[PDB]
Design a protein around this ligand. Structure first.
Ligand SMILES: [Mg+2]
Ligand SMILES: [Mg+2]
Ligand SMILES: [Mg+2]
Ligand SMILES: [Mg+2]
Ligand SMILES: [Mg+2]
Ligand SMILES: [Mg+2]
Ligand SMILES: [Mg+2]
Ligand SMILES: [Mg+2]
Ligand SMILES: [Mg+2]
Ligand SMILES: [Mg+2]
Ligand SMILES: [Mg+2]
Ligand SMILES: [Mg+2]
Ligand SMILES: [Mg+2]
Ligand SMILES: [Mg+2]
Ligand SMILES: [Mg+2]
Ligand SMILES: [Mg+2]
Ligand SMILES: [Mg+2]
Ligand SMILES: [Mg+2]
Ligand SMILES: [Mg+2]
Lengths: 191, 109, 139, 195
RNA sequence: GAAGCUACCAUCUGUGGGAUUAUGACUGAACGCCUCUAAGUCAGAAUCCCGCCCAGGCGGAACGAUACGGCAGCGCCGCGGAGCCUCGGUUGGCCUCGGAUAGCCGGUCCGGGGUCCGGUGCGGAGUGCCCUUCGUCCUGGGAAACGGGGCGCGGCCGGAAAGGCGGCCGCCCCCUCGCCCGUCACGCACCGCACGUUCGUGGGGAACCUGGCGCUAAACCAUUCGUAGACGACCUGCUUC
RNA sequence: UAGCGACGUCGCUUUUUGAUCCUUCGAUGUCGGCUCUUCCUAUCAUUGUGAAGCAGAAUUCGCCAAGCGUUGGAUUGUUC
RNA sequence: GCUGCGGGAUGAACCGAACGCCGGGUUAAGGCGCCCGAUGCCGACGCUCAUCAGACCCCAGAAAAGGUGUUGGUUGAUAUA
RNA sequence: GCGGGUCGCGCCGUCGGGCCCGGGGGGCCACGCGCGCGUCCCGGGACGGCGGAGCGAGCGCACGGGGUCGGCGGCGACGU
């Protein structure tokens, strides 16, 4: 109905320091820096507060779809602030039947190489994203932990793993085999 | 020295979709882009200037290749400043897109 | 961003329509697309005009919401909008455009002689200064 | 005489209309940077329309019939063919007056380039609508020359950046000169009669 | 049974990149939860397009040779003298990229930040510039140190995309009016009248006298071949060793 | 409601047959087969998928999809 | 039929309007991005995105049914306890 | 107690009847004084026939007047 100035309130904590040059948002923190490009969205961005770092995201007029849009900027800035403080950690227990699944990290944490996968001979070489590391975790049977900063890149990597492990031409209510995302969380605990 | 005539481009004939009316012409005339603007140019004269390989003139000095068809502005035409015109002999229709001089003849200030 | 948004009591310029060149003050917004404007001293009577008609500028006033012509005139005279309006570069631009439209031939003759004299002085002193810049960067 | 038009951020049909009307009157118009023309609509539908247009062909001899040009300059040229009366011996002279160039030629590196305001994306498209790139469309459909044109465009933008600093240097020098004195005999008359 | 023509009746070879559909997802609102969608992203194919492979347009390149003999003949350069045709314009532009819920200009700091402006654009293509200049003589005021034209000469190279224009320097014969304000008097004043001023020492062709610099060919046929041929077309040979 | 689905109900198709006589009666050579080219998709198989009363196999039903295949014979002139 | 003309692209029958030959002006039915004459109005108000959009009597292809796609509207039920 | 017609009361109104009548600036296509033609009005006004009475004539004009004329002006030969 052509509303007016919907506004979302994004708190910023004390450790991170934000800086924007337009609709391009650049965030710095302890665990690296980060940036995104919100160019195609056409929403007023502004920050207020001497060292309190309140951010307001403001869209005027619009439609109902664009009032739906104005919250998505708030949620992505929230996820970037969670990432640049803590970083995201995905814990994946590999669920295997009578056949084991061997998982190695081939080069420098980037490449993941999956083997033996229901007795298939085909070695499955999967290339992860830039800016994310992967490690076989300790003290747990075949748990695989992906750690990174940008949650889109990390979860795209997890989706690439779980769609690399996909059973063809069978029942998928039986043959429940694959590498699935079991837990989403932070790098540094208790935060 | 210097140009005294204003520049105008012959755009076509007064016409319907199917049939034409060849006893009248239209002129898109540069610098004019409004019905209110094409009021100064009423009553002015227009001249078409061309070449021919025979050698015939008027008191402009000596025989030339140059021939000229005269005429004058009747009325405005549409909103876009285009101007109807009537000449003494009708156009050759070779001149669609060739410049017709609009002279500062009958000035009425 | 968006330094100048409309308000109850923000002055406005009227670009295209029956009131070209005349300031108005915005009384109140009717619905999104037109608004009631009013001019006490700039000779324009209280009426509703669209937003794409009007051109916004930066002076504000202090009105009650939907006041009368009287209180609009009081705040107008107490804020001195007209003299402060003529003393900005915007109105200088409008004044120059009107003078250029209202030139004559003798005025254009004087403009071209002064234009030639200025551009010759510019050309000489620019050529001398860039030659001096070359002579400065030469050691 | 020559209307040298830019192509970044223009629209296909609008720019075709304005060029097609101006070319019948005689002003020789040249459309430069054809790869940067934006087409309104979603570009999946745009490639769908142009792909069905590729499907349209004569089944008896494909040499005689619908020539499907793939270069974007030729795309815009075919669009202007569809709007000029080319079968008449008026529009054929009109198309011979019209020139078009993908990329930028060496005369038009330095000749000044106009921008039609009635055909801009910024003016026409409500900002939440989706658009296209004719360069993207042509690279998807058979025009194999994006990687050359991108390199040449980077090169010429690098040369234009080295020209603009020189021009801004000259303007700094002339405003230093106008900050110096003795032009003010004329400037009173000039401000009275529109400096 | 030679040579040749021939057989899935002998043998040999037949190949990858891109965007994406169906679908599966991620992030995430609408709808404080959820959600593959609303903006954003990813994987994704006998389809689609291109690559690989055939034919190359009233499509364009770079290079070679560029007509003796006995006059010739023919090119580049400078011309001037005539003469036929085709027709249009009557000051020129010498350039940032990119954005629009943003951007331009000016300036200590180590291309970025901080700072100063300007802004419905005036460091403006509704604007800029030689320019509204008829010429000349007289004669004074301001501006004026580069001249400014070039048969110039000589050097440098800037430009790849479809480049020949642009600029610098040193020399050369002249201008110290190469522009404004002012004094002074003539120039065809052709006696009311259009096709005037132009980029033009335009574009093309036929020849005529002129000085200077150079050049002394190649196709096609006749013939011969047969890797090629219905005929053409095509592949080739033809040094007096 | 995996797969079907009566009682009803709304359509699409011109590859069946029918209705009409608009075109040709100073002539459009009439069935079927042989050969040969191209197109459609309302998909039989192959590529990629989803759902099953899908354990595997073998099937069935959908979707994108006409690129490429869809034969050898006894009978009847046959289409079938 | 016996009839042209201006629109409906294209037409026998449609919609205006009926015809000697011409110059000026005005309109009808229709239309005003460009073919192609006219909106080159600083037109007014809203609706809709389509991976098969939509675009004008006659008219040259579509229904029953469904949509938390959006936009209004009706009738109820909750919310200051 | 309500309505239909009649009668009389004051107030409306650049109202109408050129109204009227006597007194105390503007408009008009409206003109023979002497005296005697009839009426009306309080010696005068207005009309038809007469007592006055439209005196004198067309002169020179000017013309938004039975569809325009200049008592306006230019320019050009041996090849157009
Ligand atoms: Mg199975
Ligand atoms: Mg074979
Ligand atoms: Mg999807
Ligand atoms: Mg019949
Ligand atoms: Mg029949
Ligand atoms: Mg016959
Ligand atoms: Mg026959
Ligand atoms: Mg036949
Ligand atoms: Mg096929
Ligand atoms: Mg009959
Ligand atoms: Mg009849
Ligand atoms: Mg009829
Ligand atoms: Mg018709
Ligand atoms: Mg139709
Ligand atoms: Mg017809
Ligand atoms: Mg007529
Ligand atoms: Mg109408
Ligand atoms: Mg038009
Ligand atoms: Mg609905």
């Amino acid at each position: 109905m052509k509303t007016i100035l919907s506004n979302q309130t994004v708190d910023i904590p004390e450790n991170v320091d934000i800086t924007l040059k337009g609709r391009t948002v650049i965030v710095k923190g302890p665990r690296g820096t980060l940036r995104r490009d919100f160019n195609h969205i056409n929403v007023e961005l502004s920050l207020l507060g001497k060292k309190k770092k309140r951010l307001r995201v403001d869209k005027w007029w619009g439609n109902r779809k664009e009032l739906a849009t104005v919250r998505t900027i708030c949620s992505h800035v929230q996820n970037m602030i969670k990432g640049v403080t803590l970083g995201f950690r995905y814990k994946m227990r590999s669920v295997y039947a009578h056949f084991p699944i061997n998982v190695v990290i081939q080069e420098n944490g980037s490449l993941v190489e999956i083997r033996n996968f229901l007795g298939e001979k085909y070695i499955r070489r999967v290339r992860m994203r830039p800016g994310v590391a992967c490690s076989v975790s300790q003290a747990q049977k075949d748990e695989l932990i992906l750690e990174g900063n940008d949650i889109e890149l990390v979860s795209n990597s997890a989706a690439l793993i779980q769609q690399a492990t996909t059973v063809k031409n069978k029942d998928i209510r039986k043959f429940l085999d694959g590498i699935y995302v079991s837990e989403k969380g932070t790098v540094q605990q208790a935060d | 020295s210097g140009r005294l005539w204003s520049k105008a481009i012959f755009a076509g004939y007064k016409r319907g979709l199917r049939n034409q009316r060849e006893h009248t012409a239209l002129l898109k005339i540069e610098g004019v882009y409004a019905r209110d603007e094409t009021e100064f140019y009423l009553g002015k004269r227009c001249a078409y200037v061309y070449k021919a390989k025979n050698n015939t003139v008027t008191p402009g000095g000596k025989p030339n290749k140059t021939r000229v068809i005269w005429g004058k502005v009747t009325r405005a035409h549409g909103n876009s400043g285009m101007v109807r015109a009537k000449f003494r002999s009708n156009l050759p229709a070779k001149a669609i897109g060739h410049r017709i001089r609009v002279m500062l003849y009958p000035s009425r200030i | 961003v968006f330094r100048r948004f409309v308000e109850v009591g923000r002055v406005a310029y009227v670009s295209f329509g029956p009131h070209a060149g005349k300031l108005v003050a915005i009384v109140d917004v009717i619905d999104q697309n037109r608004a009631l404007v009013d001019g006490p001293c700039t000779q324009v009577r209280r009426q509703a005009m669209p937003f794409k008609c009007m051109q916004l500028t930066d002076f504000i006033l202090k009105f009650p919401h939907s006041a009368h012509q009287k209180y609009v005139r009081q705040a107008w005279q107490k804020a001195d909008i007209n003299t402060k309006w003529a003393a900005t570069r915007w109105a200088k631009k409008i004044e120059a455009r009107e003078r250029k439209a209202k030139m004559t031939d003798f005025d254009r003759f004087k403009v071209m002689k002064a234009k030639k004299m200025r551009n010759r002085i510019i050309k000489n002193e620019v050529k001398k200064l860039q030659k001096a810049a070359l002579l400065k960067a030469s050691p | 005489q020559v209307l040298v038009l830019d192509g970044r951020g223009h629209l296909l049909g609008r720019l075709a209309a304005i060029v097609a009307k101006q070319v019948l009157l005689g002003r020789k118009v040249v459309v430069v940077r054809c790869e940067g023309i934006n087409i309104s609509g979603n570009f999946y539908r745009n490639k769908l329309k142009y792909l069905a247009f590729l499907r349209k062909r004569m089944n008896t001899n494909p040499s005689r019939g619908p020539y499907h040009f793939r270069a974007p300059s030729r795309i815009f040229w075919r669009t202007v063919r569809g709007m000029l009366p080319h079968k008449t011996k008026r529009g054929q002279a009109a198309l011979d007056r019209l020139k078009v160039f993908d990329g930028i030629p060496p005369p038009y590196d330095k000749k000044k380039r106009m921008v039609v305001p009635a055909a801009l994306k910024v003016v026409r498209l409500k900002p939440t609508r989706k658009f296209a790139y004719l360069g993207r469309l042509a690279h998807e459909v058979g025009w194999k020359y994006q990687a050359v044109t991108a390199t040449l465009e980077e090169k010429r933008k690098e040369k234009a950046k080295i020209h603009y600093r020189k021009k801004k240097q000259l303007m700094r020098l002339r405003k230093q000169a106008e900050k110096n004195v003795e032009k003010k005999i004329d400037k009173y008359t000039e401000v009275l009669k529109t400096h």
